[PDB]
Structure 1
């Protein structure tokens, strides 16, 4: 059982120190591997759209999830960013600056989209929500 001695302060403190690593949440933050992620600990990130792609929805669903491969400007890493809402892929062109954000599960895949953990927030400095609701238009043409 637990060590109870009044003089066992060191052992209890050292025991807990070793055992905290067994916790996945603790080890994820204190490992230092977060800085190796594409965002490198950032909430958002800008990137350049390399190409427009579709990803087959995971079973038992059946659909083509519209995504876009994006290369991050600050570190040059390539990621897949999901484009939400209906018909918003038409607002995205290749070699365009897009602001990327997490998908809501802190680096984990969301929904039936396989291996996707990012979504597109802005395109050409304009939020997709504004374009979807016809609030604004992209600055070109």
Structure 2
């Protein structure tokens, strides 16, 4: 608009500016973080919820292989997790809830819900009802 489109020595100036102003996110991402990350955790705790209403979800803190410790939410009803184990984390965004930057999605040692149907691959079990959980527990022990 200023110039719009001319010649004699002049396009370049507001090419520079646009990059510089840039909102979104530069240089892909990692100041924590992304990608499938398997943090082995030993903190089971409970944390509060966002300004709108209350609850008390049960959470488990996990320390990541890529060196970070944060609180992650667990989805599905019920759960157990043991010696360590390795529970794999999606790192999805709420757009926010306090200190809860990620959640650990179902993955290996991260179990799924009390023998059901309803459904079974959100909130999740085993063959027909259960069958998977029985086997799952065995793995870490031996």
Tell me, yes or no, if the aligned pair for 2:49 and 2:98 is still in contact at 8 Å.
Answer: yes
Q: Which structure 2 residues correspond to residues 38-53 of structure 1 after superposition, within 5 A?
A: none
Q: Which structure 2 residues correspond to residues 1-141 of structure 1 after superposition, within 5 A?
A: 3-7=4-8, 10-11=11-12, 14-15=15-16, 17-18=18-19, 21-24=22-25, 56=57, 103=104, 132=133, 134=135, 137-140=138-141
Tell me, yes or no, if the aligned pair for 1:49 and 1:71 is still in contact at 8 Å.
Answer: no
Q: What is the TM-score of this pair, normalised by structure 2?
A: 0.22
Which structure has more helix as a fraction of its residues?
1
| Residue 21 (structure 1) shift | 1.8
Greater than 6 Å deviation, 4+ residue runs? 29-54, 57-102, 104-130
| Residue 4 (structure 1) shift | 0.7
Q: 1:77 to 1:104 in 2, by over 3 A?
A: closer
Q: 1:23 to 1:104 in 2, by over 3 A?
A: farther
Q: How far, CA to CA, are the matches of 2:34 and 2:122 in structure 1?
A: 25
Q: Which runs of 5+ in 2 are unaligned?
A: none
Tell me, yes or no, if the aligned pair for 2:45 and 2:60 is still in contact at 8 Å.
Answer: no
SS in 2 for 1:57: strand
Give the number of the structure whose alpha-carbon radius of gyration is greater. Answer: 2
Tell me, yes or no, if the aligned pair for 1:48 and 1:97 is still in contact at 8 Å.
Answer: yes
Which structure has more strand as a fraction of its residues?
1
Count of residue pairs the alignment pairs up: 141
| Residue 3 (structure 1) shift | 2.6
Q: Which runs of 5+ in 1 are unaligned?
A: none
Q: What is the TM-score of this pair, normalised by structure 1?
A: 0.22
Q: How far, CA to CA, are the matches of 2:74 and 2:59 in structure 1?
A: 30
1:42-69 deviation line (CA, Å, top 9, x unaligned): 9999999999999527999999999998
